[PDB]
């Protein structure tokens, strides 16, 4: 007899052991990048004679 989650299972002759394991490991990586660049120029010149 072998019960997993209230279900009747039968171990075959080739399998030694089959045990349930939670083993929950999750990863989540988030990266952001922003760059601002501004340039302004206004030159005024006047000459009179």
């Amino acid at each position: 007899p072998h019960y997993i989650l209230n279900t009747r299972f039968r171990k075959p002759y080739n399998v030694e052991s089959y045990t349930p394991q939670t083993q929950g490991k999750y990863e989540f990586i988030l990266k952001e990048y922003e760059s601002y660049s501004d340039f302004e120029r206004n030159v005024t010149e006047k000459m009179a004679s």
């Binding site: 007899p1 072998h2 019960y3 997993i4 209230n6 030694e16 052991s17 045990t19 349930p20 394991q21």
Partner: protein, 48 residues
Amino acid sequence: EDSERRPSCDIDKPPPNIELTGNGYNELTGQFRNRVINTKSFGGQCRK
């Protein structure tokens, strides 16, 4: 064939994953190993 004396006294479910506890253990790797102690046996003494 003729199994008298009420075999297993209608006891159906064993502990869920006692085989994991009965399984071997390694200390330098932190990972479990194969089963060593056969806890699925009963020896005839049914313990409900």
